[PDB]
Symmetry: D3
Subunit: 257 residues, 6 copies
């Protein structure tokens, strides 16, 4: 008796949830058609907003696991839709560790950016949502960032891009490299325009405001103020089938050893 639990950071914005979190849950459920599908979010604030504003009840990972144990699932596979191994993913790791003894079999599949091969595969996957660029144009990816030590992931990926002359850059809102680092670096290459894309699973209004709004600290205004015009593309990573396939391979690696 078998479950698949898919844990997202979450979003209160319905249309982006459907285009991204649902599309990933759909693909993961198809790869495990012998599993019943369940959802949980790590963001308690988002869960609370959904309850109070919308009357929609999303489980935390602890609640989802308690319910799975209650309903008699002995075998639970969990897949994180997080991008990095930071506080949010670790919330899953810790809750899983606490309740692990309630199950005969548990596995837990890791965030997008975990191993060295993940970074290589992610660059390949990102290539499928990028346009054909001229030599003085680049795509710029905007991640959340982190205070947790896993914030190092964003710079490592940017470093790999630069080393292989991939035509994109990566930074973070809340951590290094911040947008001014990339702007200084791109200005020195004589990059002439950029396309901004989120390096986040969903693109909710606040992500959109950090990237694209008319606020002077938006990434678009910052690039524009440097004389490098910026065109925002408002899709989450969940909307890219090659990203979904990496989440599917992680679940399947958690399943096999």
């Amino acid at each position: 008796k078998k479950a698949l639990l898919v844990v997202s950071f979450g979003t209160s914005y319905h249309d982006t949830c459907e285009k991204n979190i649902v599309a990933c849950e759909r693909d993961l459920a198809a790869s495990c058609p012998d599993r019943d599908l369940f959802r949980a979010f790590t963001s308690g604030m988002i869960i609370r907003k959904l309850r109070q504003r919308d009357g929609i009840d999303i489980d935390t990972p602890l609640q989802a696991l308690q319910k799975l144990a209650a309903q008699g699932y002995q075998d639970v596979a969990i897949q994180s839709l997080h991008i990095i191994n930071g506080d949010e993913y670790e919330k899953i790791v810790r809750e899983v560790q606490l309740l692990r003894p309630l199950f005969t079999r548990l596995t837990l599949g890791v965030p997008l950016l975990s191993s060295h091969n993940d970074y290589v595969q992610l660059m390949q996957a990102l290539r499928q949502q990028m346009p054909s660029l001229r030599q003085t144009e680049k795509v710029v990816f905007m991640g959340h960032g982190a205070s947790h030590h896993a914030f190092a992931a964003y710079a490592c990926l940017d470093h790999m891009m630069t080393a292989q002359r991939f035509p994109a850059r990566v930074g973070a809102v809340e951590s290094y490299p911040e947008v001014d680092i990339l702007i200084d670096s791109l200005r020195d290459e004589g990059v002439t325009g950029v396309h901004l894309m989120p390096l986040m699973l969903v693109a909710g209004d606040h992500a959109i405001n950090d990237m694209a709004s008319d606020d002077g600290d938006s990434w678009k205004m910052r690039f524009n103020a440097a004389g490098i015009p910026a065109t925002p593309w408002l899709s989450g990573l969940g909307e890219n089938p090659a990203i979904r396939a990496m989440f599917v391979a992680h679940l399947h690696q958690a399943l096999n050893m």
Copy 2:
């Protein structure tokens, strides 16, 4: 009743242990003169070699904690001398988690490269073991690397160096960026010579062989083969007082909140 437990990766080489692990234990003990000092190593292989070859018994973190609980220490402060938050540090985290209920108070201080400020402070600390360089010369730091996701730390630090035009580079033996990435990148800047230094707590013969030997895959031979002569400096980071002071600040941050 109070203990300080200092946990290193470890080394079987006595002279480097004294110059690096002992110098750090000395400084940490001085900052907590109300604590009795204890040692443990994460590397079981190194512990085994010390027992079998030398008749020297070093505790694992689990054994050190069992002994501390037995001897009646209610208050234990632990400081990791690791460089990154990878498998080795996590071995400490997990053993601490298991035995935490044996103590009234426990804290655990983090590896050198944890927060965004650690990277900035580490660059400042490394500056005190570097020579005054000409504009076409750089220091190259050689870390261990990791398969764990924390391998991203080495590239993030290299990325920070490059962004601020710090006159050094960082890579890893076993993970990205490997030495050929740095060589290609430095050759493109017209860097003319490098000084190799380990980005490891100790400099044991095997680290020395990866960095400095006459094997074609040593970092020195690789730089030399690219026509960039390399001068190896065989000190561990433990020998740098500004690195020791960061480990001391981490212990003290674990102590205060």
Copy 3:
């Protein structure tokens, strides 16, 4: 400050719950008149049906334990009303293990079929719900079965019956021995009629359908098709005072050592 928690598999059928689970809770509470009485069910599906269809709220064992800890019970005795040591009982064992540290004293009394003496005592107890049979008639007991390894209990009990020439047989719906095994074996003895009784705590409509319905795979139709007419008796084991007394002795054995 003392509690008695009685944990059943559960049922959504009110009349069988009263005749079986309530009768057992009543007897256990009388044997521990210094304890406040609490209920929990292992079947989450049954709990959910009761909430959604009936507005009746039954605790899982985890919820019951959290509430007991909250209300200040330091001393909790738990008795399982399960028949075997399979997945359902183990759900209790695991939840008890997780929350055990919340209590000064906990005990947990075992399912009906645990030790060698339980099987002997159960045969004696079953004898009090059986009629006086002619030599070519037998009682046939229908257990649930299990995929868990404790499914072996049903065959072991059948084996004991046969060895001592007890005038009954035991099998399981979902596991070995299935009804065709018993039918082949009884047909070879020249058994001429059987009375079917559940070897389950309660007799809900679905148990009744497996045993007694006009579906060709019901145990009654299967015996009838073999030319051995079958008379269904629709009581759960909870309705037998000698079964209740075994559950009472298990609680009391959990209490004493």
Copy 4:
């Protein structure tokens, strides 16, 4: 990201809750202005009464911790408003122990009467809610008591008072020294009148009934029957700023080491 959780025994009486538990939560929050403030009660019975009678929902410590983990608090400081280290405080210790792995940093500050210095400081703090007495008058403090071994605290404090000729006595409703012990002892000194004060955080109607009512077993009637007239003062300890400052020092000692 930082929380302060303040855990009380609790009360269903609103006016005493405000004058005592709120005043303590207020002071603790002011000493940690970087923390978001949360409440939990140990008394499940009181929590249940508040829900069912008032529609007010107070968390148990387990629920508060689950919610804190859900909302992403990595750093939680908890302060107990209990008077002694008995069953109620231990409920906190046990729930904290269970959920500790959900947090990067946790601390837990201890009840009022913990160390030898607490007793000395409490005597000093009580002096600020006492009147100037004549030599044949004393204040009598009425604690709850305990079956747990920490009941010894009340006699130890009474013993310290007597040794230093502090003009007060301490006993307990439910444990040693009960009021008749103090009455016999005070009668032998020729004490002529007493003022009764609770040695409890709040003064709810039931505390007030034990201390002050016209029931023959109230502490006031007992002293009066011995010919030592008793004047009840119906404030909880929470109403005394010097008691609040001890709870603040405990939180701050939990924070520093």
Copy 5:
């Protein structure tokens, strides 16, 4: 970095250990050639005898796991060589549960007699160590037995044999069915001779004494006294390649899901 830990009940008899436990460890290691091989025994008494008499040190499962964690194995596969899910296997389950958090990945493969298919496959495997029998001759298998509830396994297997007219019987030394049950049952079939084989992983001198000695309570003397001559075959199950292949399939099922 990957380990295989093979846990036996154990034996102090060297020749049977080699022919049985070593042959199983050999096969399991060949099926996981990417794993380093480790041993542990559940029988502490046997471990103690080996240390004190022979100077041979065998790990308990806890010690083996501590050492694996120390040496940096992140991925450990464990296979039990036990026959049933009783106290001995559960010792593994409990120690694994305790130390599970020390590893990134752990699995645990189950005893020979676990699922319904195991019993069918075991009957097939036993057929390869049996002779071609005449119709009045049978093989009798002698298991250890158990007080734990898993003792039911031996009767369940005997029941399956009888149902399918397999030409063997199974019982236990220490639990039901004891040898007299099988003797009474075989005498009633007019069975004329039996071959005794152990249903134990190893055949040490004490197993051999229970089965084969000249003591009146040996299984051989008991059958002989009933006028059914008994020929003892002194091999453990480990010596049967089809049994080894079931242990290999269990490890591989633990590995895949």
Copy 6:
């Protein structure tokens, strides 16, 4: 399969160990003649001294429990020979909590001074090692003391003695009431001589030095300097059969509920 583990604080002095710890282990083993007897000490320092000076190996409670689990004991009863519920007893509680899942049944019997009835029974038991005193003479008991909150036990017992006019007093070396408190209080009663007895399980040379030596801070010199001559009696509490019987009743209360 059943064990009795008796855990002492410990002593390095052989003669006092035999007269006290052995006499208690003897009595406890006689009350549980179905249990195999085991020893552990809480004092790691004492354990270390015994190993290094004497070649005697005493288990910590963790080691004793690991060995019990290894040897297959499913049912372990543990009895503490401690006097109070302080750090030493809690070391047992915590180690028991950690390893509890390794056993089917565990219980843990509490220190001498736990419940209100323990204090009453202890006063009765102490009466059997006291002489017949004149009205101006008293026995003075010398406990260890504690920084842990359970130090309150010593004053509570002294308070009970005084309240009931029992002809003894109690204090502690390391905590309140210290000897000067008792001396001031006894001098005010016109007590003319005292007999000093330890309120410790064993009377080792250091206890003897605190109580009896010619050092000015010994309890004997302090009483003598106050003009109240003191006669030391150098027996531990273990030597008193009525104390042993309380430890036996605690084990038996842990066994029954």
